[PDB]
Design a protein around this ligand. Sequence first.
Ligand code: QGA
Lengths: 231, 231
Amino acid sequence: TKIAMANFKSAMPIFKSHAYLKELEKTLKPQHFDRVFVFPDFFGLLPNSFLHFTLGVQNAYPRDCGAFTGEITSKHLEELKIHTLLIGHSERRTLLKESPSFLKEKFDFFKSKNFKIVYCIGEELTTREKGFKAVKEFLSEQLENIDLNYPNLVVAYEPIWAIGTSASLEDIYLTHGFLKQILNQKTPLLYGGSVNTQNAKEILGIDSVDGLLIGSASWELENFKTIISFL
Amino acid sequence: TKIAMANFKSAMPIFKSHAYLKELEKTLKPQHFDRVFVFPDFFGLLPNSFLHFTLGVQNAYPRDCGAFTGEITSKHLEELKIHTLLIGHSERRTLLKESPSFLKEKFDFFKSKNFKIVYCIGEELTTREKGFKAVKEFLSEQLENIDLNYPNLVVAYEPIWAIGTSASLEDIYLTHGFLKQILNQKTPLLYGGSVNTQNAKEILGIDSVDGLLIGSASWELENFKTIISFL
Ligand SMILES: O=C(CCC1CCCCC1)N(CCO)C[C@H](O)[C@H](O)[C@H](O)[C@H](O)CO
């Protein structure tokens, strides 16, 4: 089976998120544990007692604990038994200005904690429009920031122009084909960006697509359930 | 002189924070409601049903909800019935790179929702080195960034060089004295930066000090309760 990950972003009400988790846990079985992932916000999550899917957080500060006002640190996550994290999502790079150095600080830190890391990359439409060389250069430069051989690494390719809008199959086939040349053959490579119940199955048909990172469409349990069925 | 606020930052275990809030509620009375403040991290807080102290958050993104990976938004706080927030704390300005325009965005957004705002300001040691005229000009520019007449505003003067180590009574008397010359007369002006059970009473003795923003020293409930008796 392939991968399916839900990114709640900051769109799910606290109560709705909590029920979502409990329901999902009842609908899924043990074999979905390492196939399905859910990333709710700090309020929407719950202690990690789930055995049918993987619980992760959308962000964290790269320190055990301390004077980091407004931030969540690793000891807290350890207390919640969460050990999966998103890093470099486009929204944080742009709206919250997380530079490459900061993202590298996070990767190195959480890697040292043996976390499963879903590292996000993606180019702007302008880069896409400059040609193949421009996209290859941009993406390969983003991957230089991390350790591509860390076995608990997952790379999520989300073209920025497709987040919250969807990349064409031709686009996904060629881009992922290139990425597969740069990444460890064991690293799962997910496609993200406007994935929905309508285009999921097709996206999943590309051999260089090991899974999906679903934002908007996953905020409805049933939609996610349906996507899971295509895995 | 009458207000005490606790900033848990990212230093308190989840279970401890929860127990802290419940115990504080049992200890204090209704008279402490608008005099005592507690700001736990996102995990350490609980639904706001507290009547003996005010519950607040250390940060939030200026939107009702949406595609903001890693952020907590307005609607989330409404569910928890939280309408008190910290903005501009030094740790976020530097470590998280929150610019003045970003802080202003947060201020204007939560202003519209009648949130009680605790706007933090404080100069670097380098600035203090130059001279009082240097700090006065630096502080002015920081205050230049918001609406000083906002009825639910609270300003917290916190010398960056005194965070996590305390400013002399002399520098507090002078710097607050200056701040009282541009701030609205009714705006509570707090002092923060290495406030502890040992210097609490004296700081509070200064007329231009309306309260304290307590960090590391508040992590131990008994320390917080002691400082409360000085109000
Ligand atoms: O093809 C593209 C973008 C491709 C790039 C290629 C490089 C030059 C700029 C253009 N889009 C972008 C639109 O976001 C169209 C969508 O792939 C289709 O509209 C979608 O697959 C279909 O409607 C599903 O039923």
